[PDB]
Amino acid sequence: AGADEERAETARLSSFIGAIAIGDLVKSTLGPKGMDKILLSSGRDASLMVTNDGATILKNIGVDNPAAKVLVDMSRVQDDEVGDGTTSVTVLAAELLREAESLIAKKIHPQTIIAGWREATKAARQALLNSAVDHGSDEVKFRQDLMNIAGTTLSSKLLTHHKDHFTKLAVEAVLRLKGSGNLEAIHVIKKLGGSLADSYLDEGFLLDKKIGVNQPKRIENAKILIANTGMDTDKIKIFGSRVRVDSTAKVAEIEHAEKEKMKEKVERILKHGINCFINRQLIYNYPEQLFGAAGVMAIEHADFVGVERLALVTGGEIASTFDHPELVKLGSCKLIEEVMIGEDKLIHFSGVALGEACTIVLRGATQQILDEAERSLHDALCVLAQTVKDSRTVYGGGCSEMLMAHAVTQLASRTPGKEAVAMESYAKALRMLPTIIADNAGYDSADLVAQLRAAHSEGKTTAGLDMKEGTIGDMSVLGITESFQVKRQVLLSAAEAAEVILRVDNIIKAAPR
Amino acid sequence: AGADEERAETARLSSFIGAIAIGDLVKSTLGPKGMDKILLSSGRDASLMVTNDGATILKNIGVDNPAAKVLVDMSRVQDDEVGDGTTSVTVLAAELLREAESLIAKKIHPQTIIAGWREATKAARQALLNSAVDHGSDEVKFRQDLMNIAGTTLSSKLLTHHKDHFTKLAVEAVLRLKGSGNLEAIHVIKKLGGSLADSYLDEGFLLDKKIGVNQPKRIENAKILIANTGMDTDKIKIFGSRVRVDSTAKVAEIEHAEKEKMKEKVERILKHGINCFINRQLIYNYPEQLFGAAGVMAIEHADFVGVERLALVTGGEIASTFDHPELVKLGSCKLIEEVMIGEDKLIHFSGVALGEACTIVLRGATQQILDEAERSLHDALCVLAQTVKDSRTVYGGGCSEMLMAHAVTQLASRTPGKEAVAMESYAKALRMLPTIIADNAGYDSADLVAQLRAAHSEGKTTAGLDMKEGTIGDMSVLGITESFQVKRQVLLSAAEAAEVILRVDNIIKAAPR
């Protein structure tokens, strides 16, 4: 914010360079046959993280001075709105900058060209409802639940040999989730034990905390108690001061007063039959001895985020002062256990009556490759949730991109003068995607482009790029699909992201999320 | 002393340089195709200020020694009477200085030449009587409310693709505003999302605070409580002074006394069914636990300005001590809730019975330019208030400037030789405006000048510069008009502001501190 004012040819360059740098790397990550990239960095890193998620690495690091971090930051909101699919939105935005070089020859007002985006809105709209896509998504569904798009998201991913099976699991998770109540209460955690499943579906919530060395091993017909206020007692406001006493015999009454807090907790805890206590904060030591004899399992410093999800699950409770027990607290009673899972001990909450919220647990052999499950897993939750609400999708594998390109070529001749060259340039941008997908397949890129264009022109929406084949094939059999709004938003977002580059001279940061 | 001293050519020149420097930055700003400017300076500035409105930026900063700050100050008096819309008054005054170069081809007394300023008065009258203007815009008004001047103020702003729709909305806001109420209760915030409307009109008030993580999600048949005094207790008007109590046993009573403040609050609260509590200041912790269990949503440290506006809307209240809830307070009861409109959550107050005090919330793409709208809408409220009050307007798009220019050319020849040279210089000043509006359009400036003059001299006031066409067109169809007093004052103000600089010869500065 101190200066570094750049104009026209050089200012354009800073954005232009940012777009080209990002485009080649994200480029290798598209399609069923994606390429893994290894990153090395110093200071609070430790090792090479292999991520083939075009958005995860970009979010993690803001490496340098040029403007692109905000453009990158934006893709996550897109994830919120529709998710990842396969990364492609960033690539299209970068490629319109390529013909900026052609424009120097044009030599008038770059802003005048910006008009083409006003037409770009038309292009976004024309693409919309002309694609001819899938139909159905009835609700729950028997065999269309998955073995489709999640597989596509993971096809580019290394884990597919084992994870194609657990990618399948994710849709079961979405079916329970759907109804009235938004996106809430979804939690999943990694484990180091190995099994031919690589995942377990928990009917309840997974935590990872323990009361202490002593206490009963298992509880039956468990009741749940949640307290806002801590077990600790002493200071308050209007302290009563710091004390000295006349015989050190009265210091004992102070000790006695502590016992009263212990007694209230045990006397009404017993009537309920209390099997487990969960508190989101520090716990006072005296009650700890009490809980072990009673036969009650308590949790010290339980995290608040886990608790809120649990409340929806159990049926909730009204959390206040120690009066909180019995009726003011609602507790589910199926099964609460501390269960050893092949090695690292954890606590399992299960059998929730509500059914609205559930937790997913992962297992594996034990290596860098097994850790990618955490990487892949974040991606799986978002893809499926989007598929239900949009109720619309598009054909993947580049099928969508070639058809649109045929239509846009016509447009450049149509538009007047100055607009026509700029509109034309946007059209040729779509051409690179077919080439990028073919090259990584191990087949000659030049042959692929021509054959691809002929099939899309013909009118078959299903036909697309088949990398294993090396030619063009039927995308629908493959099961590669993209959500409808991913394409709808990218067209509008690319247009509003590219325009800002030429128009604002002074950059840096501050504002909304 | 050692102070800067200048004579003849240099003294005049310092004034001369200040006028030229301002004109180049301001020229981009004028008319339906204006440019956004960002100025950065170090220290006592903090962040980038980009102001579309020319008057606001000049006032703010006194960058250097050369005099121009006083000329700038005059624009604000104009602003109270009318001000904004588009800025053109400053530009015209600056160009009058360029012809002074020709004045050296004379040499003794500029004051006889100064007769031109008197001549300028003659020019002002011609503008004010000629043309046709507009009449009514009498009060409330159904279709003449907007799609006129507000659109034009916005036209110089880039956002006007979807924005012009937003400008149209603002007149409805002024209709409620106007009356004996004066200028009060108007608040506007833009939000993340994507819709064609890009804006929502809220009959109530928009706020951004939360009681805490806990509390009911939505309140229905809401009762609103506003308190002047905080929930904090320990002071009073009579202290009971510094506290030391003979032993530790008594301090227990004091804690219990605190409970009475908690308890009084609940007893009054339950009968009413209180759904929301808003306090302007720090809030004591004990009540916070109470509100959550009850099912009441409270707001901590709410801004006072928002509160006053709300009182007029709800029906008001006598916000005193805890005796405050019930009949002494009036609470509107439609619906108060926390809503995630998109991906950012805010609290919405709506459904006010009174009907006169509304809040406007805007939707945009996701980045600065949208905040530009925050800039523009605030400006908009002032524009509408003046247009109705003035009851006078002129045609926009530079239509006004060319007509006056045709009349002034005759005047130069009409006067005797020396008067004619000075008289013609004022006349040519009007010529640059047609050129300035056309140049930012993206069309060659020279072609535009010849065609424009021919249409105005014909006798058609409505005809003007059409940037969208690339030639000239009918201004009236567009719906672009400028407030009438901007023209009276600029011509009257321009003469004496510039004149004081010339009237003093050989400015000499010396012998100070």
Side-chain angles (χ1 to χ4, degrees), chain B residues 366-403:
Chain B
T366 37
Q367 66 280 130
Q368 180 180 350
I369 270 210
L370 180 60
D371 290 333
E372 181 180 0
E374 180 180 90
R375 187 190 310 313
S376 180
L377 180 144
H378 180 258
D379 290 340
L381 180 281
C382 290
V383 170
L384 290 314
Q386 290 300 150
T387 300
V388 66
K389 190 159 234 159
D390 59 50
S391 88
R392 300 290 280 275
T393 75
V394 300
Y395 293 90
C399 290
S400 297
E401 290 110 76
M402 206 284 117
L403 180 61

Side-chain angles (χ1 to χ4, degrees), chain A residues 232-250:
Chain A
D232 290 340
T233 307
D234 60 340
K235 30 205 90 296
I236 300 170
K237 290 180 180 203
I238 20 200
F239 306 120
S241 306
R242 300 180 70 110
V243 300
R244 240 230 60 145
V245 210
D246 60 340
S247 220
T248 316
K250 187 173 280 314

Side-chain angles (χ1 to χ4, degrees), chain B residues 46-335:
Chain B
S47 267
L48 280 70
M49 290 300 290
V50 37
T51 310
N52 190 270
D53 188 343
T56 300
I57 184 251
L58 290 281
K59 292 290 199 40
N60 290 339
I61 190 70
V63 170
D64 60 340
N65 183 251
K69 186 180 180 296
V70 300
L71 180 150
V72 170
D73 202 2
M74 290 296 290
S75 187
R76 180 169 50 82
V77 70
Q78 180 60 343
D79 181 349
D80 180 341
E81 290 180 359
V82 80
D84 63 340
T86 60
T87 55
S88 296
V89 309
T90 300
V91 170
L92 290 24
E95 60 190 310
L96 131 301
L97 290 80
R98 282 71 258 213
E99 290 70 30
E101 190 280 340
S102 300
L103 277 59
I104 69 170
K106 290 180 180 59
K107 182 180 280 130
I108 20 30
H109 46 110
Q111 40 240 90
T112 300
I113 295 170
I114 300 300
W117 280 256
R118 180 180 290 168
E119 291 300 334
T121 300
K122 217 280 182 176
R125 290 180 60 152
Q126 290 180 40
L128 308 180
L129 240 20
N130 288 281
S131 280
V133 300
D134 70 340
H135 215 280
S137 210
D138 50 291
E139 230 250 80
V140 177
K141 190 69 180 176
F142 294 90
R143 208 78 210 144
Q144 292 296 130
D145 199 0
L146 220 145
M147 295 171 70
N148 290 331
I149 190 170
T152 215
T153 300
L154 280 70
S155 298
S156 70
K157 298 180 180 56
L158 180 60
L159 40 280
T160 311
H161 60 118
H162 290 157
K163 189 70 174 64
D164 48 288
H165 180 70
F166 288 73
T167 216
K168 180 180 180 264
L169 180 60
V171 282
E172 290 180 351
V174 308
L175 299 180
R176 64 190 180 224
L177 180 281
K178 180 170 60 57
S180 70
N182 204 60
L183 210 100
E184 290 180 272
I186 300 170
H187 180 70
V188 60
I189 300 300
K190 61 70 190 177
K191 210 79 199 178
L192 263 120
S195 68
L196 182 281
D198 291 310
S199 70
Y200 290 90
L201 190 279
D202 290 340
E203 60 280 340
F205 180 90
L206 180 289
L207 230 230
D208 188 340
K209 290 180 180 64
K210 190 180 188 240
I211 331 100
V213 180
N214 70 90
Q215 258 92 34
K217 190 176 300 319
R218 180 180 290 197
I219 60 170
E220 290 180 310
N221 290 334
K223 282 80 180 56
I224 300 112
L225 194 329
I226 300 170
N228 290 339
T229 176
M231 300 290 280
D232 290 340
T233 301
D234 63 340
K235 293 180 180 296
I236 324 240
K237 80 90 170 176
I238 190 162
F239 290 99
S241 254
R242 300 290 280 88
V243 271
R244 180 60 231 274
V245 180
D246 60 340
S247 300
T248 273
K250 189 170 280 296
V251 69
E253 79 180 350
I254 300 300
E255 183 232 356
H256 199 250
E258 180 60 30
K259 299 291 180 190
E260 180 62 10
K261 290 110 210 177
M262 174 70 120
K263 180 163 60 155
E264 70 180 348
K265 290 180 180 168
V266 70
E267 294 300 320
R268 300 290 171 179
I269 290 170
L270 180 61
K271 70 190 190 168
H272 200 199
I274 190 70
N275 295 100
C276 183
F277 180 90
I278 176 170
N279 190 340
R280 185 250 120 202
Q281 70 188 240
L282 290 310
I283 200 160
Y284 200 72
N285 290 337
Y286 287 78
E288 298 300 300
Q289 290 180 40
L290 180 61
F291 281 90
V296 180
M297 180 180 60
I299 300 170
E300 180 239 290
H301 200 270
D303 290 340
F304 181 90
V305 70
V307 170
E308 290 299 300
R309 290 180 180 180
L310 196 286
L312 180 286
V313 170
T314 166
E317 47 190 280
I318 310 300
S320 295
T321 60
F322 300 98
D323 290 340
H324 60 69
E326 75 170 59
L327 290 69
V328 290
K329 290 180 180 356
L330 290 310
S332 61
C333 30
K334 175 180 180 40
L335 180 60

Side-chain angles (χ1 to χ4, degrees), chain A residues 23-101:
Chain A
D24 290 339
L25 290 310
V26 298
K27 124 180 180 40
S28 70
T29 323
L30 290 80
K33 317 310 283 176
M35 287 83 210
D36 290 348
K37 300 291 180 224
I38 60 170
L39 290 170
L40 226 187
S41 189
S42 300
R44 290 180 180 80
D45 283 40
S47 70
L48 339 130
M49 290 295 290
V50 47
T51 300
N52 70 338
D53 183 350
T56 300
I57 190 280
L58 290 281
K59 290 300 190 304
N60 290 339
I61 190 70
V63 188
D64 60 340
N65 157 56
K69 182 180 180 264
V70 300
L71 180 150
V72 170
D73 187 350
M74 199 260 150
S75 185
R76 180 170 56 88
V77 70
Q78 180 62 27
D79 180 342
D80 180 348
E81 290 291 87
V82 76
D84 60 340
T86 60
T87 44
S88 307
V89 307
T90 300
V91 170
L92 289 70
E95 60 190 40
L96 98 303
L97 260 52
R98 291 300 100 75
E99 52 269 343
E101 180 61 18

Side-chain angles (χ1 to χ4, degrees), chain B residues 437-474:
Chain B
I437 299 301
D439 180 287
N440 60 40
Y443 292 90
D444 190 344
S445 299
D447 180 341
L448 180 282
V449 170
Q451 70 180 340
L452 180 67
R453 290 180 300 190
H456 285 82
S457 70
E458 180 79 70
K460 291 180 180 176
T461 65
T462 68
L465 282 320
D466 190 340
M467 290 177 284
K468 290 170 65 176
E469 240 338 270
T471 50
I472 60 170
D474 190 340

